Amino acid sequence: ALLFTPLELGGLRLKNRLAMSPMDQYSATLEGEVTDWHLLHYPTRALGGVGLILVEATAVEPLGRTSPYDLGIWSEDHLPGLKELARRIREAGAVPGIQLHHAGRKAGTARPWEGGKPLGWRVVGPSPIPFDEGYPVPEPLDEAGMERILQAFVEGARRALRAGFQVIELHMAHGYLLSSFLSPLSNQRTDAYGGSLENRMRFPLQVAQAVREVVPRELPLFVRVSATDWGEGGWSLEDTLAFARRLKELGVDLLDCSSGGVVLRVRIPLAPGFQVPFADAVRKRVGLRTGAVGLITTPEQAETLLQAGSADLVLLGRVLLRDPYFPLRAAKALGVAPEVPPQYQRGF
Amino acid sequence: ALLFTPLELGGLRLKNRLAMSPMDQYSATLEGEVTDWHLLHYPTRALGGVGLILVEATAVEPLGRTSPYDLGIWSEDHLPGLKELARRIREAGAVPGIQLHHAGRKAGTARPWEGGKPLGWRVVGPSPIPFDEGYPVPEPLDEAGMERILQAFVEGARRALRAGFQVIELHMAHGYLLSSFLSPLSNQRTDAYGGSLENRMRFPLQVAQAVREVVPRELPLFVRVSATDWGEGGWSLEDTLAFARRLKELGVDLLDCSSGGVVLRVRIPLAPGFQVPFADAVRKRVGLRTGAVGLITTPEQAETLLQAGSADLVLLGRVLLRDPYFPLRAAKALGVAPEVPPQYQRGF
Ligand SMILES: Cc1cc2nc3c(=O)[nH]c(=O)nc-3n(C[C@H](O)[C@H](O)[C@H](O)COP(=O)(O)O)c2cc1C
Ligand SMILES: Cc1cc2nc3c(=O)[nH]c(=O)nc-3n(C[C@H](O)[C@H](O)[C@H](O)COP(=O)(O)O)c2cc1C
C-alpha cells in the first residue's frame, strides 16, 4: 500500500503519504499569537497519524491577515508560541510545516461564525477592483510595496525555520495576494506586472525565488495554487502548466493543487476527487511532484490516485475536523498494522 | 433519539447519555501526578462530545496502585494537577468525573507494554491466595487495616470534590480489593467478612456508606461491579441483585455493570452487548439506575438498548481510543444536528 510507504522529499523522509491540509481556526490573539486552542487542535491530529502537518495560513504582515484572529509571523515575539507549537506536533509524531500568507483584497473580514463581513481595512492588490459588493477597493501596489511584501515573505520563512518548522508552503491560491496577480479577473494592470501571462507570473515568481534562496535544499518548499478560477476568460489549467514549469526550474519541491476563490459568482462541479486531474496533468506533463486535495475521504480513494500516478502526496482537510484519527483506522482497513501510541494498543 | 436527550442525575443535567469509560493510561509520574499525556488525552474526548468523562482508576493509597505509573489521590500535592485536569475537561464541554481505586492482590505490576509482570510488592487482600502463578501471596487485612483503607476512600472523595470533579465512582469490580471481598473464589475468610453473602458484602457496603455521607446529594455517586465472575461456584447475577438492593437503600445513584477479572482461567462469551443483560436485570428487578458497558460500538446499538429500558447511561471504552469524535458523528447518523465547536462547523 503506497499510502503507508515512506516519501522522500529534499533531505526528509515522511513516514507516510498523508498530510493535514491548511485550515484557519480564527482562534489566535489580537497580536496573532498562538493560544491553548492550537496546542490541543494540532497535536491531536499528529497522534491521529499524519506524516506531515501543514499549519494554517500565517500572516507575513498585519494587513496580510484574513481576520483579526489569524496567526502571524511578522515579529520576533511570535517566536516563543510558534516554537512551542512545532515542538508539540513533533513529539506527537508528525513533521511540522507551515503555510505563509497575505490576504490581499480579501484581507480584514470577521470570523465565519460572527457574520464574516468586511471591517474596512486599507487593503492592497494589483488593481483597484473590489472582491464583491460591500468590500473595500484595494490600493494598487507600486514597486516599493511589492519589495516590502517580498522581504516579509523572506523574513517570515527564516523565522519559521528558527521555530523548528521543516516544510514551508507559499500560499499563492484562493484569491489572496499572489493568486490575484495571476488571474486576469482581478489583475488588469498595464505595467510590467499585468497583461501577458509572463507579466502576471512575475511578482509571484520573484517571491518564490527569494524564499528558495533562504530555505536550505534539505528542507522542502511547497507552493499552493488555484489550478483554475472556473471563470470564463480566467486562469486555466494550461496557464498552470506554464507556471509549474517555471517553479520547477527555480527548485520548488512540490505543487499543491487547489482551485477557485478568486471571484465569487462561478459554477464549480464539486464531486469526490474533482481537483485530482489538475495534480495529474502537472505531474505527468511537467514532471514536478504534486499534492492532491479536495473531497478525499476514504482509504481506497487515496490509494487508487497514488497507484494511477496522479500525485505524490494526499492532503486531507474536512475529514480531519470530524475524524482526527482517520489515518490510524485507514491503515487497518488497507491491511497495514498501524503504529499507535502504546496507551491505545488494545483499541486496535 | 434518547441517546441525545438530557439525563438528570442528582442535581446535574448531562447533555446526553454517552460517557467515557475509565481507562488506565499508565502515564503518571512515579508520585502518581498528572502529566502532559492526560491533559491532551482527556480534553480531546470532551471536544469529541461525551456528556460525562470518567477519569481512569485513581489510587487512594500507594499500595492501591495497579502500576508505578497510575494516578493517585493520597496526598494534598496531587490537588494542583487534578484540578487542572478537571478544569480542562469542563472547558472542552464535558462534566468531569473520577473513579477511586485500590488494586488489592493485583497491585504492583509492570505496564502492559513492558511485559506486565508482578514487581513483588507487599500487597493486601481478604485471604492469602495468590491471583496466579508468579504473584505475591496477599496479606489478610485485620479490622484496623480495613478502617485505614475505608478512611482513605472517604478522604480521596473529599479531595476529588475540592479539585472540581462532580461525579465520583467507586471501583468494586475486576478482581481488585472490594471485588475480591465479594467473590468466594478470592475470599475464604471465616470471620465476620467471609462465608455468607451478607458477610462478603459487609466491607464493600461500609465503604459505600461512608463515602455517601461526605458526597452531597446534588453530586452523583456511582459503583462499578463485576455482575458475575464467570467461574463455577462464584459470584452470580442473583448475588448482584441482592447487592444492588442494598446500594439503592444507602443512596447510591447508579450501578455501573461490568464482569470478570477476579480469576484468570474462565471462559467468557464475548459478543456485542454481552454485559447489557446484567444492567437490564438490575434496572428492571431492583429499580436502581444503570450504566451499560462492553463492546458497544455503533449509534443504533446504543439507541436500541435505551429504548428497551436496559440502562440509563451508555459507557464507551475502546471505540474512543481509536475514534475520539465518535459521539459527534453518531448524532448526525441518528438525524440530530450535533453541537460542535464553531471552528469545526464546515466539517459537519
Ligand atoms: C475552516 C477552513 C479553513 C481553511 N483554511 C485554509 C487556509 O488557511 N489556507 C488554505 O490554503 N486553505 C484553507 N482551506 C481549504 C482546505 O485546506 C482544503 O483545500 C479544502 O477544504 C478542500 O479539502 P477537503 O475537501 O479535504 O476539506 C480551509 C478550509 C476550511 C473548511
Ligand atoms: C487500556 C484499558 C484500561 C482500562 N482501565 C480501566 C480502569 O482503570 N478501570 C476500570 O473500571 N475499567 C478499565 N477498563 C475496562 C473498560 O473501562 C471497559 O469496561 C471495557 O474495556 C469494555 O468496554 P469496551 O468494549 O467499550 O472497551 C480498561 C480497559 C482498557 C482496554
CSV table of C-alpha atoms and ligand atoms in Angstrom, one decimal, chain A residues 343 346, chain B residues 21-26 56-57 99 169 171 174 224 258 275 293-296 315-319 321, ligand 2:
chain,number,residue,atom,x,y,z
A,343,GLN,CA,-1.5,3.5,25.6
A,346,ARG,CA,-5.9,-2.5,23.0
B,21,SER,CA,-15.5,4.6,30.5
B,22,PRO,CA,-12.5,4.5,32.9
B,23,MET,CA,-9.2,3.5,31.1
B,24,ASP,CA,-5.8,3.4,32.8
B,25,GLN,CA,-3.1,5.2,30.7
B,26,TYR,CA,-0.1,4.2,32.8
B,56,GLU,CA,-9.1,6.3,35.0
B,57,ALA,CA,-8.6,4.3,38.2
B,99,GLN,CA,-13.0,6.6,39.6
B,169,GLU,CA,-17.4,6.3,41.1
B,171,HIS,CA,-14.3,0.7,41.7
B,174,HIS,CA,-12.4,-6.6,38.1
B,224,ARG,CA,-18.8,-0.4,39.4
B,258,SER,CA,-19.2,-4.9,34.2
B,275,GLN,CA,-22.9,-7.4,29.6
B,293,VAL,CA,-20.7,-1.2,29.0
B,294,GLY,CA,-19.0,-3.9,26.9
B,295,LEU,CA,-18.4,-3.9,23.1
B,296,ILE,CA,-20.8,-1.0,22.4
B,315,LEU,CA,-20.4,3.8,28.6
B,316,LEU,CA,-17.8,3.7,25.7
B,317,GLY,CA,-14.2,2.5,26.1
B,318,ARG,CA,-12.2,1.1,23.2
B,319,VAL,CA,-14.1,2.9,20.4
B,321,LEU,CA,-9.2,5.2,22.0
C,2,LIG,C1,-6.3,0.0,28.4
C,2,LIG,C2,-7.6,-0.2,29.2
C,2,LIG,C3,-7.6,0.3,30.5
C,2,LIG,C4,-8.7,0.1,31.3
C,2,LIG,N1,-8.7,0.7,32.6
C,2,LIG,C5,-9.8,0.5,33.4
C,2,LIG,C6,-9.8,1.1,34.7
C,2,LIG,O1,-8.8,1.8,35.1
C,2,LIG,N2,-10.9,0.9,35.5
C,2,LIG,C7,-12.0,0.2,35.0
C,2,LIG,O2,-13.0,0.0,35.8
C,2,LIG,N3,-12.0,-0.3,33.8
C,2,LIG,C8,-11.0,-0.2,33.0
C,2,LIG,N4,-11.0,-0.8,31.7
C,2,LIG,C9,-12.2,-1.5,31.2
C,2,LIG,C10,-13.1,-0.6,30.4
C,2,LIG,O3,-13.5,0.6,31.1
C,2,LIG,C11,-14.3,-1.2,29.8
C,2,LIG,O4,-15.2,-1.6,30.9
C,2,LIG,C12,-14.0,-2.4,28.9
C,2,LIG,O5,-12.9,-2.2,28.0
C,2,LIG,C13,-15.2,-2.8,28.0
C,2,LIG,O6,-15.7,-1.7,27.2
C,2,LIG,P1,-15.3,-1.5,25.6
C,2,LIG,O7,-15.5,-2.8,25.0
C,2,LIG,O8,-16.2,-0.4,25.3
C,2,LIG,O9,-13.8,-1.1,25.7
C,2,LIG,C14,-9.9,-0.6,30.8
C,2,LIG,C15,-9.8,-1.1,29.5
C,2,LIG,C16,-8.7,-1.0,28.7
C,2,LIG,C17,-8.7,-1.6,27.3
